[PDB]
Amino acid sequence: HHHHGCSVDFSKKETRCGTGVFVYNDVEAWRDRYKYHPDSPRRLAAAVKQAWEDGICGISSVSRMENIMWRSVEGELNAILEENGVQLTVVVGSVKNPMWRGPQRLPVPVNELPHGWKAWGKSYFVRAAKTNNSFVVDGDTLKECPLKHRAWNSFLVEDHGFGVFHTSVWLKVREDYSLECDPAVIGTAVKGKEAVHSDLGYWIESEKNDTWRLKRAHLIEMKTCEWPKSHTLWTDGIEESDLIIPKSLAGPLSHHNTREGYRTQMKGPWHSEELEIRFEECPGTKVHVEETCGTRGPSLRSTTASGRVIEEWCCRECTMPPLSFRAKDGCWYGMEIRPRKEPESNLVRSMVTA
Amino acid sequence: HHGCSVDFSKKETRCGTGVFVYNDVDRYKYHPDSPRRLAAAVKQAWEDGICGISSVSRMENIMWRSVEGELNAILEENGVQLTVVVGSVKNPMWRGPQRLPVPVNELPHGWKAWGKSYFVRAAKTNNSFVVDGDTLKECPLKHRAWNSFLVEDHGFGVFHTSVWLKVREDYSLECDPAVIGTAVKGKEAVHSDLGYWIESEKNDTWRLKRAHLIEMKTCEWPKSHTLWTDGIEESDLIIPKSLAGPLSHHNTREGYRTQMKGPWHSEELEIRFEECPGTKVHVEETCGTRGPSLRSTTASGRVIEEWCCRECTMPPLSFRAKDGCWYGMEIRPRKEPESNLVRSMVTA
């Protein structure tokens, strides 16, 4: 009996309390306010040095949280590396979607560097100078460091504290190999006719109609780890080819990740920075269920590069309402739905695949 | 949606929006939609050979007790000589093969007012429509209806305080998912409903941590409300599938198999992994075979001091009833013969 909480209603001014399990929507707070505590300054420095001595030149980021962690750590890490006489410099760029997967893993050094600090927020005083050898974190550096020499998914979250004025995150370096997404920050719940699969960057909702189905999703990233089966509801009798969000894109292997008449969206607009999956027509558009439509393929935006909308769309076997994506660039359609009258070469498409 | 919570172990508090699952193991108000529809359904079932009802859970039994007087008032007002008798609940609630019908028309006379202001009691009639009790000889199990109601309220909402039920149109086998809530967060998970609260934890592997049951249902836990349903055998679940135990890896423990012959006759158990007061259990491969669950005290109150298991795992599986502290099927006494102890007379 440690997790006690209350819930409030703002239209009736009443409150119910009790004990149980509480799952919070933390997706919309992709915030830099957090303060990050990787393994240790000396320990992280020794691990990165051993990785450089092993022939690993860089890192692919699992999610935005690791990218922000590297940005917050890089300066002090460089300073402590210089204070130990190691000619190496860490350069951190931005993330690009989808976040592809690397085959290497960081090592766990037997001993750390015996010169430097003991805490991450302690002190970063003297800035380091650029060095010949650069250990580059993700960015537009695929030429000087290919993906095959680039590590991925090397950190293990230990504690997610919630203080009065700030919230802090504690990390370590994994002893053993892993393919799954970190389970310490995953929360799944179902009650009645509604369910949620969620973590720090995903918030996926389901509903019970005649059949359980996907209702809407809100993604602020497209990671490529595997959703653990222990944090998934109804993981049997489901084919990987039916999941709306592909299994390669960290979509849960669940009956809650389906929709009747649609198949896996391997060719959706996965290049965006943030998208939301909705089941309705795009603004000023309309779709027909007629057999004589075209074969499914890459997803198409509803507005031409000139800014003109299209008012004719068809699908062969889809079910109303249609599957539509929502990025800042516009309102894409699903792979099933194709233009009815206009040629498809006049429209912009998705050049990525899962 | 909006709420706040406290964590006493980590000493932190927080607020926000999300999804909350509470421990409900009364706060809510359970009565059927229409008394006249229920009266018509009962009469039509009686005319077609169906004589009794076996409750799925305690909630249905409480609802029947609340509604029986008004139901008899409607039955007597309409010229029908039928009596509804409601008795106590004996665990486990066994499953009946019949179902209540849906009447095409309701009774011509009566009132749909939830509560009956008129306390005019009807005269006892020689025809009895018994609800669950010690009445297995007036109405045997083969003529009893079971799981005939649909809880027609759902959702993540938590401020309603009023639950409505109606007779369903389609046959069903599963526990009603309107009152089921399961949740996992980090290293702790729960499978729960109005009567079950089953907890699992993340050790080197996921396993059963502790359970707290206040009834013994025999419906089937829905697969849509279960975590990690694949790659699991039915012979490994600690709580058997026949007793509405979820078919999941969270319902397992290393070195143990399904407890088909545990003390399910009791009225409230508490499964946990530790010794009974003043007892120790050893690990010797020469111990006995799996069999019925035995208490730690004899019929006179004498506490046994020596138990063995062949291939179990410390700490030992034990049940905490109100009148004893039993063990699992794999733990047997080292010295005392078993023919004088008390063992469970029920099987799943």
Partner: antibody, heavy 114, light 106 residues
């Protein structure tokens, strides 16, 4: 009501077949539906079941090869069959279950040989 | 739950009483059904819930027994009542049938 099976015929070993059961008088989304087979000159055998909630179960003989399914719009059952063996030759029925099988189909014939 | 049905075959003339016996290796609550199948035709449900009779089935059929055993009884062996009979349990997955009992004209 009336249920009618389809898709039966002749297939060589290792081939794939897909049966259908068209339902009239009842909708399949609110019913428990079974598939039952009977090898020529032998007794009845249970194959698979789908609940009204969508849960599926299979026999140990066909597990990993057969897949029961349904479609809401067309109101029909399906039974996808893969890696067919010689011992899969029988007559296949679809049925409705409410505690008992009270509505059977006519049956369809599946033969596996060369 | 395995179901053993005896006798394997039966022969008797018109007007006699014949009883078919089914056994279950475990406990079934009351979920036992009796079916009748004729050559070339789909099976037909006769008795359900141990004793409950199905509509349209004549009154010559009745089932039910005490203990771990179940029986199906024929009142008057009409000459259109020669077929194979099976017992089924609908209590546990997997569903199981009996091997069948053939009733032939004597």
């Amino acid at each position: 009501v009336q249920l009618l099976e389809s898709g039966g015929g002749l297939i060589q070993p290792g081939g794939s077949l897909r049966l259908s059961c068209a339902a009239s008088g009842l909708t399949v989304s609110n019913n428990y539906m079974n598939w039952v087979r009977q090898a020529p000159g032998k007794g009845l055998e249970w194959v698979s079941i789908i609940y009204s909630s969508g849960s599926t179960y299979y026999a140990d003989s066909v597990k990993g090869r057969f897949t029961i399914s349904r479609d809401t719009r067309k109101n029909t059952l399906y039974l996808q069959m893969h890696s067919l063996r010689v011992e899969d030759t029988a007559v296949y029925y679809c049925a409705r279950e409410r505690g008992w099988l009270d509505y059977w189909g006519q049956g369809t014939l599946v033969t596996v040989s060369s | 739950i395995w179901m053993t049905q005896s006798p394997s075959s039966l022969s008797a003339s018109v007007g006699d009483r014949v009883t078919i016996t089914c056994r279950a290796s475990q406990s079934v609550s009351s979920h036992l059904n009796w079916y009748q199948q004729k050559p070339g035709k789909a099976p037909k449900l006769l008795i359900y819930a141990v004793s409950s009779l199905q509509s349209g089935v004549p009154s010559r059929f009745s089932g039910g027994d005490s203990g771990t055993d179940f029986t199906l009884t024929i009142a008057s062996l009409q000459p259109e009542d020669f077929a194979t009979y099976y017992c089924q349990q609908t209590y546990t997955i997997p569903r199981t049938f009996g091997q069948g009992t053939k009733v032939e004209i004597k």
